[PDB]
Design a protein around this nucleic acid. Sequence first.
RNA 1: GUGGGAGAGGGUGGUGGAAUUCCCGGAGUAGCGGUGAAAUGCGCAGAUACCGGGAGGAACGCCGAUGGCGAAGGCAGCCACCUGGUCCACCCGUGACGCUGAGGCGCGAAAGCGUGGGGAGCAAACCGGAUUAGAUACCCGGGUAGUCCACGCCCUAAACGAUGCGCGCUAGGUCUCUGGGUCUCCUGGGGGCCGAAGCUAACGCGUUAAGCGCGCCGCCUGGGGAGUACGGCCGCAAGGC
Lengths: 119, 73, 88, 101
Amino acid sequence: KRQVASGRAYIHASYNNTIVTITDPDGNPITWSSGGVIGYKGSRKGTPYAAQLAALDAAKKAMAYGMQSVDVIVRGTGAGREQAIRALQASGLQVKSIVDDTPVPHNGCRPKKKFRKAS
Amino acid sequence: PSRKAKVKATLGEFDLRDYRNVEVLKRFLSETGKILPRRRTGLSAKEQRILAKTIKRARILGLLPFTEKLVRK
Amino acid sequence: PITKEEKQKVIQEFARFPGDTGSTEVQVALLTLRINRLSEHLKVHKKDHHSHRGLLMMVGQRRRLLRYLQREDPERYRALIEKLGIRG
Amino acid sequence: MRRYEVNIVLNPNLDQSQLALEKEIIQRALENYGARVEKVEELGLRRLAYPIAKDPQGYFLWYQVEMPEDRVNDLARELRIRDNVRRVMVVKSQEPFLANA
RNA sequence: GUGGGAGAGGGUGGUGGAAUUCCCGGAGUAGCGGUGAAAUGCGCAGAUACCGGGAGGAACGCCGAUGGCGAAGGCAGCCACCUGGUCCACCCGUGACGCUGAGGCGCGAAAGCGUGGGGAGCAAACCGGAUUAGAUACCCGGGUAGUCCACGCCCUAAACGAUGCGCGCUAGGUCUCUGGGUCUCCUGGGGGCCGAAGCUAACGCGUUAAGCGCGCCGCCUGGGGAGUACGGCCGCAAGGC
Ligand SMILES: [K+]
Ligand SMILES: [K+]
Ligand SMILES: [K+]
Ligand SMILES: [Mg+2]
Ligand SMILES: [Mg+2]
Ligand SMILES: [Mg+2]
Ligand SMILES: [Mg+2]
Ligand SMILES: [Mg+2]
Ligand SMILES: [Mg+2]
Ligand SMILES: [Mg+2]
Ligand SMILES: [Mg+2]
Ligand SMILES: [Mg+2]
Ligand SMILES: [Mg+2]
Ligand SMILES: [Mg+2]
Ligand SMILES: [Mg+2]
Ligand SMILES: [Mg+2]
Ligand SMILES: [Mg+2]
Ligand SMILES: [Mg+2]
Ligand SMILES: [Mg+2]
Ligand SMILES: [Mg+2]
Ligand SMILES: [Mg+2]
Ligand SMILES: [Mg+2]
Ligand SMILES: [Mg+2]
Ligand SMILES: [Mg+2]
Ligand SMILES: [Mg+2]
Ligand SMILES: [Mg+2]
Ligand SMILES: [Mg+2]
Ligand SMILES: [Mg+2]
Ligand SMILES: [Mg+2]
Ligand SMILES: [Mg+2]
Ligand SMILES: [Mg+2]
Ligand SMILES: [Mg+2]
Ligand SMILES: [Mg+2]
Ligand SMILES: [Mg+2]
Ligand SMILES: [Mg+2]
């Protein structure tokens, strides 16, 4: 119940799951989707295909709000990242720009043992 | 690699110890706010060592970024 | 720190003859200056050990020079110590 | 007495009265700590690479002075007391180091 | 002595941004998380993903190196103050003032101890979920001491170059950090690699010696028993010598 017509698309990619939040120009979310929003449950959410489906689902739900153009922000390094971007590429949405916003520390906090030896 | 071009080869006479000069300094940073390796800057150990400190000073003053968003991709 | 005028003042104060920068008197005077300054610095900053090692070395060097002076000319030594205020 | 360079970033939203007041405060605080002013450069309002106090811009002041070492820190602290002063950076002067000479 | 140089050497105070967690607000909905696969866990008291504001602790990305400094332990955002060592040039001053060093004294990673603070993240013990024949583990979800600060203890280590310190002597080549100079090159102080003579059981070392020599200190004398027992000294204890 908005008719935004232009906005942002945040792709958050993990080895475990990919999740896509589509927002307005001020960053307020409109719709969102993920591997588990679709049928997928287990490790399969981490799959590129699941990211494709999540991206398309998010875009469709977004075009229900009557949206046309998006700026894509990409955070995280994992499978299905580039697939999510590639699905949004032509989802029926015009992608105006792509940007990698993935957060990295200046070495503030000690990682869990699994992630140690690299910082 | 990095045989494309170098930054020291581009500019003319300039002060390395001047932290208020943005026009010069911002050429030593990448697409992100990262300070370029010597294989890029073309500088030398001493020169580089000074450049780093002056760039950090400029960052604290608010003239230079600590980090930038990566475009394209 | 120790400026040039201070150093020159003490040097020209303890010099045996005009233009003497090297005599044992002068050396012990300069060392004493530095030791006093450093000890004053270690009154505060008592957690600074690396400087304390410097102090140790300086004290040792001074004591060795004074030992030499004592062995050589006990009068000049007596005068030196009396003047600087070392040895109690 | 050593040479220092004083960098001061000011709030860009200031009008002339308040700005002149801030410069008065800075001048007076400088003189009160025994700093003689060798020279001064005012670059005015410039953009920042990142927001400072939610401001995209800043007002820049530069004072090259000669002052006693023992007071320097206390000077800096004083300059930071005011609310309209965003940054204060006091650097020991150094001769220029040139590349491509 | 004079004039200069480089540096994450040390101490104190200040200050910067990224990220994590937490709180507040906005928008938004059915999951998120996690694994080989899962489950516990978190979420309709609205999580996850997104934006804005705030609080707090801890560590400093790029530069960054095969780099630098320190006697060793070790030292890395930036600024200022206090302060140790060191290298070079001048050839100015003293005139053997030297080297080593039992004992003594000081310093001494981490863990650990005492009193008081502090506590974001991580995490012994512990509490759970999985795996397994079992799983007092490896993997997953929590989590206390602790990790941080002040003051006082402890004195250990693969505290390692597994190579005590000082001096002199014995081909060169190559890369690198930092001085000086008549700056292609010469000369000095560091850090690496290959190698003359020579040494070595071999591996290898080779002007940064493990070569040729001199001075002084420490230590070894087959393996297990055992760094144990006893005694003494030190420690609040753990425990150390
Ligand atoms: K070997
Ligand atoms: K005993
Ligand atoms: K106990
Ligand atoms: Mg998954
Ligand atoms: Mg100096
Ligand atoms: Mg000198
Ligand atoms: Mg210095
Ligand atoms: Mg340091
Ligand atoms: Mg909220
Ligand atoms: Mg929880
Ligand atoms: Mg439940
Ligand atoms: Mg959250
Ligand atoms: Mg808190
Ligand atoms: Mg080490
Ligand atoms: Mg002479
Ligand atoms: Mg003579
Ligand atoms: Mg000795
Ligand atoms: Mg200790
Ligand atoms: Mg500890
Ligand atoms: Mg404690
Ligand atoms: Mg945890
Ligand atoms: Mg089995
Ligand atoms: Mg079981
Ligand atoms: Mg665990
Ligand atoms: Mg316990
Ligand atoms: Mg307690
Ligand atoms: Mg080793
Ligand atoms: Mg060599
Ligand atoms: Mg050499
Ligand atoms: Mg041979
Ligand atoms: Mg060799
Ligand atoms: Mg036997
Ligand atoms: Mg034994
Ligand atoms: Mg044994
Ligand atoms: Mg034992």
